[PDB]
Design a protein around this ligand. Structure first.
Ligand SMILES: NS(=O)(=O)c1cc([C@@]2(O)NC(=O)c3ccccc32)ccc1Cl
Ligand SMILES: [Hg+2]
Ligand SMILES: [Zn+2]
Length: 256
């Protein structure tokens, strides 16, 4: 099935998922000089105080930190969004080297990694129904650079040992996603898609301008994870990013 290797990677995906060459695919390059400040954007509201994490899962592509979404507890609203979007999970994309790893790029600059916090529109009852809608999802994207350690990431880093291979999960309750955010919520926004198959075009993207910094040894442990399942030959989980896709005269708006 789909992956990131030579034979199952990003430009193989279109065969099972034709929407890969669609009109609103993600990620994209953010050309800072082409992005326009948008006055009609309301303030962005990230409310993660009541967030209820449950478990961490190696799903063979990345690792997901999953949340209880059966009540309004961790919600994104405002900015380009209408209504309320509930946090369901977060995950990262990263590289084999510090000079690559992010999915979005800024004036063609690649960051060492990218975090995705995934939320679904409550008017649709659940995630499965929301991903059938043009405004079903909202993803908050955050860039990672190598420098100083990110304290609020270490609990994730420390548990990666327990989920080294595909299908492994561990209890991961009481994780606070607020410790992953940069200071500024200045962002770019554009309509787009999931960046993994089925690549559904249901996402309002909100990509923060300010990167978070993580330590060399934090990213190194991401790179010790496995794409393979237990008892299989070791395939290091690295370079699990899709490259930038055609903008196709969508407009990228700046909040700033
Ligand atoms: N990379 S991503 O943030 O666009 C994203 C990835 C996923 C996914 O790769 N992570 C999953 O666990 C999953 C399950 C079914 C389909 C797709 C996925 C889900 C939603 C989103 Cl918004
Ligand atoms: Hg959709
Ligand atoms: Zn993602």
């Amino acid at each position: 099935h789909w992956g990131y290797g030579k034979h199952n990677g990003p430009e193989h995906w279109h065969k099972d998922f034709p929407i890969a060459k669609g009109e609103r695919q993600s990620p994209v390059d953010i050309d800072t000089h082409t992005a326009k400040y948008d006055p009609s954007l309301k303030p962005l509201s990230v409310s993660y105080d009541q967030a209820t994490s449950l478990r961490i899962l190696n799903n063979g592509h990345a690792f997901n930190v999953e949340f209880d979404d059966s009540q309004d507890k961790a919600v994104l609203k405002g900015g380009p969004l209408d209504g309320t979007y509930r946090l369901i999970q977060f995950h990262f994309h990263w590289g084999s080297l510090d000079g690559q790893g992010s999915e979005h790029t800024v004036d063609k600059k690649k960051y060492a990694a990218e975090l995705h916090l995934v939320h679904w529109n409550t008017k649709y009852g659940d995630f499965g129904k929301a991903v059938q809608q043009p405004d079903g999802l909202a993803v908050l994207g955050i860039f990672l650079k190598v420098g100083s350690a990110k304290p609020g990431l270490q609990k994730v880093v420390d548990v990666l040992d327990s989920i080294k291979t595909k299908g492994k999960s561990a209890d991961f309750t009481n994780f606070d996603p607020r410790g992953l955010l940069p200071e500024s919520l200045d962002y770019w926004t554009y309509p787009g898609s999931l960046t993994t198959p089925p690549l559904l075009e249901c996402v309002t993207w909100i990509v923060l301008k300010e990167p978070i910094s993580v330590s060399s040894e934090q990213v190194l442990k991401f790179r010790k994870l496995n794409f393979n399942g237990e008892g299989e030959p070791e395939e290091l989980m690295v370079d699990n990013w899709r490259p930038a896709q055609p903008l196709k005269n969508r407009q990228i708006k700046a909040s700033f």
